[PDB]
Enzyme design. Structure first.
Site, PDB file in Angstrom:
ATOM      1  N   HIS A 160      14.931 -46.802 -17.402  1.00  9.53           N
ATOM      2  CA  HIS A 160      14.594 -48.150 -18.034  1.00  9.53           C
ATOM      3  C   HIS A 160      13.232 -48.603 -18.223  1.00  9.53           C
ATOM      4  CE1 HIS A 160      19.357 -49.018 -17.660  1.00  9.53           C
ATOM      5  NE2 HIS A 160      19.419 -48.231 -16.597  1.00  9.53           N
ATOM      6  N   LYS A 216       5.654 -59.161 -20.899  1.00  9.32           N
ATOM      7  CA  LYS A 216       6.416 -59.916 -21.799  1.00  9.32           C
ATOM      8  C   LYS A 216       5.744 -60.944 -22.667  1.00  9.32           C
ATOM      9  CE  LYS A 216      10.736 -59.061 -19.106  1.00  9.32           C
ATOM     10  NZ  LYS A 216      11.650 -58.435 -20.242  1.00  9.32           N
ATOM     11  N   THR A 245      17.462 -56.244 -24.546  1.00  9.41           N
ATOM     12  CA  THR A 245      18.950 -56.418 -24.982  1.00  9.41           C
ATOM     13  C   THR A 245      19.140 -57.889 -25.480  1.00  9.41           C
ATOM     14  OG1 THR A 245      19.570 -56.746 -22.727  1.00  9.41           O
ATOM     15  CG2 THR A 245      19.877 -54.751 -23.641  1.00  9.41           C
ATOM     16  N   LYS A 298      21.215 -59.961 -28.812  1.00  9.35           N
ATOM     17  CA  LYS A 298      21.966 -61.119 -28.508  1.00  9.35           C
ATOM     18  C   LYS A 298      21.527 -62.316 -29.758  1.00  9.35           C
ATOM     19  CE  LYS A 298      21.946 -60.493 -23.601  1.00  9.35           C
ATOM     20  NZ  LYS A 298      21.571 -61.002 -22.269  1.00  9.35           N
ATOM     21  N   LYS A 319      13.861 -64.869 -20.713  1.00  6.20           N
ATOM     22  CA  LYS A 319      13.692 -63.577 -20.372  1.00  6.20           C
ATOM     23  C   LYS A 319      12.925 -63.638 -19.061  1.00  6.20           C
ATOM     24  CE  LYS A 319      11.757 -62.215 -24.054  1.00  6.20           C
ATOM     25  NZ  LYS A 319      12.425 -60.836 -24.521  1.00  6.20           N
ATOM     26  N   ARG A 320      12.923 -62.672 -18.078  1.00  7.77           N
ATOM     27  CA  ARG A 320      12.084 -62.836 -16.841  1.00  7.77           C
ATOM     28  C   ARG A 320      10.796 -63.087 -17.193  1.00  7.77           C
ATOM     29  NH1 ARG A 320      15.009 -61.830 -11.753  1.00  7.77           N
ATOM     30  NH2 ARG A 320      12.789 -61.995 -10.792  1.00  7.77           N
TER      31      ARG A 320
HETATM   32  N1  DKZ Z   1      14.133 -52.795 -12.935  1.00  6.97           N
HETATM   33  C1  DKZ Z   1      14.217 -52.959 -14.068  1.00  6.97           C
HETATM   34  C2  DKZ Z   1      13.826 -51.955 -15.167  1.00  6.97           C
HETATM   35  C3  DKZ Z   1      14.188 -52.214 -16.404  1.00  6.97           C
HETATM   36  N2  DKZ Z   1      14.734 -53.352 -16.829  1.00  6.97           N
HETATM   37  C4  DKZ Z   1      14.860 -53.673 -18.205  1.00  6.97           C
HETATM   38  O1  DKZ Z   1      16.148 -52.770 -18.440  1.00  6.97           O
HETATM   39  C5  DKZ Z   1      16.958 -53.152 -19.675  1.00  6.97           C
HETATM   40  C6  DKZ Z   1      18.247 -52.305 -19.802  1.00  6.97           C
HETATM   41  O2  DKZ Z   1      17.975 -51.098 -19.867  1.00  6.97           O
HETATM   42  C7  DKZ Z   1      16.088 -52.993 -20.992  1.00  6.97           C
HETATM   43  O3  DKZ Z   1      16.678 -53.480 -22.078  1.00  6.97           O
HETATM   44  C8  DKZ Z   1      14.455 -53.393 -20.612  1.00  6.97           C
HETATM   45  F1  DKZ Z   1      13.914 -53.144 -21.715  1.00  6.97           F
HETATM   46  C9  DKZ Z   1      14.011 -53.075 -19.398  1.00  6.97           C
HETATM   47  O4  DKZ Z   1      12.767 -53.895 -18.921  1.00  6.97           O
HETATM   48  C10 DKZ Z   1      15.172 -54.211 -15.907  1.00  6.97           C
HETATM   49  O5  DKZ Z   1      15.795 -55.241 -16.150  1.00  6.97           O
HETATM   50  N3  DKZ Z   1      14.894 -54.170 -14.553  1.00  6.97           N
END
Ligand code: DKZ
Ligand code: DKZ
EC number: 2.4.1.1
Lengths: 809, 809
Positions: free
Chosen positions: B350, B547, B649, B653, B541-542
């Site tokens: 990921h 980011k 993701t 949305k 987003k976080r």
């Molecule tokens: N420990 C992590 C590593 C990666 N991710 C996220 O995973 C999402 C699902 O694949 C992706 O859409 C994102 F690109 C990615 O940053 C996350 O939230 N936590």
């Protein structure tokens, strides 16, 4: 099947079956093909619980409308046992559920065995609270039990190599279908901090907060449609608690530890901080709930609408907490607040043993509850000013009566605090209440004689006859009807059947059946062989030196030695059963358990003894086990040193269930003998007066050892390793205590005890006369119903009238 | 009310009403006169839950009969959000419950707001697992989600004085009506101990035991009567645990801490022992359950009946645990066990950020899991022997590919372990999967090219359109029917409506309604005023440096400075909203939050700005908040540095809900632009290739500061205390990082970003052309359904066929 278990009507049975099936599907999420006996137990429990809810909601609605005086019973222990059968009994549902389950292809008695005991108490004091809740509901009182929801109750006892081992009682593992969580009524409780003095009074500030979350359990009365509430508090951390991050969340456990575990001491005081937090936690949350309910109806009328009963000194902090709230928060003046407090509170004492009395170090209260210490000092000063005015110049009386004890460490005597701040103080049997006024509370009795009362203990005839002994309840109802179940005095009518040959045979038949059932239980669950034709000689209660399980041990060994001496002589065969838990840190009590199993190891394997003598240690004694063994007993051992057992309640259970009693003139034994007639009891040993005479002279155990050859032989057997071949000195601590340091004078009662036991054996040889004496005991056991006890509290302490009238169904 | 919410038939509504009343009475033990909105929520939840049970029992019975290949999705995170509306949607119950509650005098939307989020994840990875469970059930796969039941999920975020504060997320306080405890299926998990070698193999002995108790939650498919299971494990101490007495009971907390709290790190690795225990706990319990279920149908057929999907490396210990069980317990030879393992396991990556990769110290595994370390060493030796044979003499490749990393402390690279022991390895968007083969896993790709795949991420159109945006779902269904809800590719049919004046007006109407609703929410729950006529510019987003919330901040300040320069010039009004949580120990992320609130404090109170510009920090961003803000957005900010966001993701949305996208060519943004057409996207900034070129040359931020006067002004404002008058140097860390230590090249994209934002503002001035471009985005968003993603996993990795056929109701 049997009449007292109620009607199994076709409509009722049909409805129970469909609701059972609904719960199995919707509630448990199971099909009949995957369901286990445990799933079936839960489906039944949910089905029966449904029948409580309508009555529960309308009972509480009724109290809101009529606004009667409310009774609050505060206790750190509620020893409830199992709930399923009790609920069926009180709702007249037992035969219907039996039929319904039978038609589904299930055995209801087998399902009943799956339920865990709610083991939230140690012994007599906790079980008394449970019997009391049952009687209060049966007598239509607006009563609430308030306590702590311990995550772990009294430990499960395992015996390994003859030693007690303790295991956590994880009673909530599978869930508790009887409770309803009420997170919406959560309340804050304060600890630590400091006191600030302002223009407008004292303020308690900088405190740590723990939340109290209530769980409510229904308490059904016997067939009157009344359902009262037992509310138990659970500790929760606030959400900003300690709020690096991960640790702060994990540290929430520190606050929630308050409700984690029941302290496992019976009749003994341990001054631990966690215990003090438990005691304040229950008191602080309960009092806010009481006041809330009172405002939702001016504090002059507070004692007209509220009674608070303190079960021992464990909730004694209710007195200064009520003062704190009235003075600091409601702004009443001291004198008015004190008047309200005294008229609201009453205190029940349960023991005279010095080691059981709560005496808290001042330095603990100083840190934990700084405002309460200030209030206690003020109470003490005003109380001692009254003593000084009544008995001028009597300086030692002042020292003796103070709530503050001087010495190495200053302590607060919680018993003195309770007497000062209560309008009534009671003991739990006539002899105990008299001892209170004559000895330990003599000074208080002289100052305020009107405060002191007696309320002899009792037991509920629902759990302790109808539930555990349906066979006996039935043969009794055949002759005198069913009204005795809530009017136990009616058992007197049975005296006209003492010469009835039909009744004699039936009473004896029920006992034999009970004994066969129990003998079978022992083989199944514990792989042990017993002779059901023998006299069942039973001593079950917590293990303590004052209860003298050791005197029983000495008698057992005497019988063994006599057999070995004259093997071909006839003796009445006996099964001697002893059970009960020891407190984990009580070394002598743990040694006594080992001694009992060690005697069994020798006696039960001696080919010359045969099946004439067996010694069994009954493992994990608890409420559900009591319900099994008590109906099976022939002889009840109640042999505490005179003046040590305040009442006893086990004694009353055995009397109601057709056992004869061997006992000292101690606690309620005195009133039991008086009710039945001394000719119908096996009384032996020193009276209280004889014990006092011996203390004045000085107790020398060597004298008895010197003058009784049979006693000397036993001591020599113990010392030399007869009962512990591989560890010859295993019991040296026991022998040393008996010979040099015995507070309870075991040797002094030995001769009379053995002689009395011979008289028991003589009567048992004549089955017809044994049974006639049994009928005379059962017939006069009426006084010992907790319905009688609660009616006396209601009228003489709480100022409310009991009612036997039904609420609409 | 609206068509896509199903039928409200008279029989159905009548039945729902009576079952609602039954639960309020029997389940909640309340009357209508005492009930609160929370009581009403629970009565509805229980009513809806009842409709799941029959389908749940028969789905699981069906899998037992047919014995299909079973899919096990292992994840440490399941970010589920609320369950009530989702359940109604999937069961076609929404209109009926709406009618039923209306007739009882209740507002269902108000009741829905009472439910707590199940916040058992951090962000994208946890939410992906949740969308995947929904799609697997909808596609009729025999799938099980396995994880941990954290007592505390992701913390609740409060903003105090512009700073983030964390509070415990006590989500279970009021109970969870969706789960079913299954204490009967409790399993032991082992920790510590040592390895013993016998004649018959290795033995793991002297271990500490923790129990794993499962809780099952139903997962309904969309209108197909399939209900799958998510099983989450809770840690429990054994009853002889530590078994002075009181402490031993309190110390049970040590074992139960395993499932206490979710680690709150997004895209970052913390090597803490407790985290390792969590990872092993889920793996060990899950694998016993898998094997149990397989035996209740010889291990050659194991991979024909079982697929295990590893969500990142968090459950990577499944590989050596499966080997342990097959070799040590089942006595398979190594080679056969390895073949089974490889064919069973597959691994999803990921991220490529180095700080997020799990590299566990050998000394931790040595103490905690001694047998697993031995197995990992053996795996490494055999794997490296294969590398040596394929690339003889290439000694550096051997160092690079080893599972064991050398250095100060030896570590195990869990990503290398996953590739070695899996038959498939996938990235989560085309550009990310290509980067994996070209950079970080290049050596592995050269050895085994066949293992490497792409599976572009997706989102569920049930939660992320029908549930959160019923107005849009409805206007779409009016034209093309309802089949698109489980066949999202049908949205392509909407391209024939791009010139339809009726549709254009309706699309625009739905957005305005969504914006009014959200503008009202802000005033009610957070007392803040916004202009619903402004462009809603949203970045949620976080919070992370990669980011680039900071690049957004720079644009905001540019707009403010331009207004202050020419106050009487027209600008398109904007509401800039930024939200997301920072990890508690991530200092820079916490500083960025403070910066955003600080900018708001200046901008929102400047009389010259008026309502032309507003900056809002959206507090406590979570699933339930996403469902509110996403349908309300006009512009979606997806501005990570090219090559850093694996997929995203959130981006998908916003596309589905009628926002246009400003973004870099990163992650799934590339495929989104490709689907819609680049003319219909606002793409700007460096590509991956440009970033590489800059790194090779060396990134000098001073160059940009020197050559862009508008950028210099902002830096000078930040440095001098313009945004923090009382603490002039508050943001010095931020400025220092931007100027000297910026891994993510914020300045490099600033010029192109600002220019692109001008083009956005230009289009927004022409409402009709804005909306036409929106329709082109919604119309081509079909590829990004998680139904498409799951169908690809099923066919290309798991070897099973999806099914859209109903089970009988
Ligand atoms: N420990 C992590 C590593 C990666 N991710 C996220 O995973 C999402 C699902 O694949 C992706 O859409 C994102 F690109 C990615 O940053 C996350 O939230 N936590
Ligand atoms: N901490 C204590 C103190 C006393 N008690 C018991 O209380 C019973 C109920 O009054 C009495 O029948 C007994 F006489 C008494 O020993 C107890 O179980 N725990």
């Amino acid at each position: 099947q049997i009449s007292v278990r109620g009607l199994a009507g076709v409509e009722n049975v049909t409805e129970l079956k469909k609701n059972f099936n609904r719960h199995l599907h919707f509630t448990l999420v199971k099909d009949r093909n995957v369901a286990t006996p445990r799933d079936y137990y839960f489906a039944l429990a949910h089905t029966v619980r449904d029948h409580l809810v309508g009555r529960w909601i309308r009972t509480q609605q009724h109290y809101y409308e009529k606004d009667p005086k409310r009774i609050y019973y505060l206790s750190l222990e509620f020893y409830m046992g199992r709930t399923l059968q009790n609920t069926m009994v009180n709702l007249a549902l037992e035969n219907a559920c039996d039929e319904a389950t039978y038609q589904l292809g299930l055995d209801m008695e087998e399902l009943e065995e799956i339920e865990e005991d709610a083991g939230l108490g140690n012994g007599g004091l906790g079980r008394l609270a449970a019997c009391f809740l049952d009687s209060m509901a049966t007598l239509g009182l607006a009563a609430y039990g308030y306590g702590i929801r311990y995550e772990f109750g009294i430990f499960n006892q395992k015996i390994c190599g003859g030693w007690q081992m303790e295991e956590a009682d994880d009673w909530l593992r599978y869930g508790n279908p009887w409770e309803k969580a009420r997170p919406e009524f959560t309340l804050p409780v304060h600890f630590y901090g400091r006191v600030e003095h302002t223009s407008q009074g004292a303020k308690w500030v900088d405190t740590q907060v723990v939340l109290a979350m209530p769980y409510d359990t229904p308490v059904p009365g016997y067939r009157n449609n009344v359902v009262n509430t037992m509310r138990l508090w659970s500790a929760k951390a606030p959400n900003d608690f300690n709020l690096g991050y991960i640790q702060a969340v994990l540290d929430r456990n520190l606050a929630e530890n308050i409700s984690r575990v029941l302290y496992p001491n019976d009749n003994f005081f341990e001054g631990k901080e966690l215990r003090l937090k438990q005691e304040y936690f229950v008191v602080a949350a309960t009092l806010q709930d009481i006041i809330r309910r009172f405002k939702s109806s001016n504090f002059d009328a507070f004692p007209d609408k509220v009674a608070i009963q303190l079960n021992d000194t464990h909730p004694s902090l209710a007195i200064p907490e009520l003062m704190r709230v009235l003075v600091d928060l409601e702004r009443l003046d001291w004198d008015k607040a004190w008047e309200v407090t005294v008229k609201t509170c009453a205190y029940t004492n349960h023991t005279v043993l010095p080691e059981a009395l709560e005496r808290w170090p001042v330095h603990l209260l100083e840190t934990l509850l700084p405002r309460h210490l200030q209030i206690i000092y003020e109470i003490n000063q005003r109380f001692l000013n009254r003593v000084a005015a009544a008995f001028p110049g009597d300086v030692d009386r002042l020292r003796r009566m103070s709530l503050v004890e001087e010495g190495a460490v200053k302590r607060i005597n919680m018993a003195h605090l309770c007497i000062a701040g209560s309008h009534a103080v009671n003991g739990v049997a006539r002899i105990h209440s008299e001892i209170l006024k004559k000895t330990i509370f003599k000074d208080f009795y002289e100052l305020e004689p009107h405060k002191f009362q007696n309320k002899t203990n009792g037991i509920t005839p629902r759990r302790w006859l109808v539930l555990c002994n349906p066979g006996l309840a039935e043969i009794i109802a055949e002759r005198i009807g069913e009204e005795y179940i809530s009017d136990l005095d009616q058992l007197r009518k049975l005296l006209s059947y003492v010469d009835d040959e039909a009744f004699i045979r039936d009473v004896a038949k029920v006992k034999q059946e009970n004994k066969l059932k129990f003998a079978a239980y022992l083989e199944r669950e514990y792989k042990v062989h017993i002779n059901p034709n023998s006299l069942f000689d039973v001593q079950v209660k917590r293990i303590h030196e004052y209860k003298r399980q050791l005197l029983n041990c000495l008698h057992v060994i005497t019988l063994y030695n006599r057999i070995k001496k004259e093997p071909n002589k006839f003796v009445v065969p006996r099964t001697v059963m002893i059970g009960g838990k020891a407190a984990p840190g009580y070394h002598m009590a743990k040694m006594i358990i080992k001694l009992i199993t060690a005697i069994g190891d020798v006696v039960n394997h001696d080919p010359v003894v045969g099946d004439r003598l067996r010694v069994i240690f009954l493992e994990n004694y608890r409420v559900s086990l009591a319900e099994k063994v008590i109906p099976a007993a022939d002889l009840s051992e109640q042999i505490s040193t005179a003046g040590t057992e305040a009442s006893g309640t086990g004694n009353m259970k055995f009397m109601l269930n057709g056992a004869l009693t061997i006992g000292t003139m101690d606690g309620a034994n005195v009133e039991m003998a008086e009710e039945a007639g001394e000719e119908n009891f096996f009384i032996f040993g020193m009276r209280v007066e004889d014990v006092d005479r011996l203390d004045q002279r000085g107790y020398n155990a060597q004298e008895y050892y010197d003058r009784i050859p049979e006693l000397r032989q036993i001591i020599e057997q113990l010392s030399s390793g007869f009962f512990s071949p591989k560890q010859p000195d295993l019991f040296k601590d026991i022998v040393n205590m008996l010979m040099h340091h015995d507070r309870f004078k075991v040797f002094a009662d030995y001769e009379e005890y053995v002689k009395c036991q011979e008289r028991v054996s003589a009567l048992y040889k004549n089955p017809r006369e044994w049974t006639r004496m049994v009928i005379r005991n059962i017939a006069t056991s009426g006084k010992f119903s907790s319905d009688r006890t609660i009616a006396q509290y209601a009228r003489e302490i709480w100022g409310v009238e009991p009612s036997r009238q039904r609420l609409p169904a």
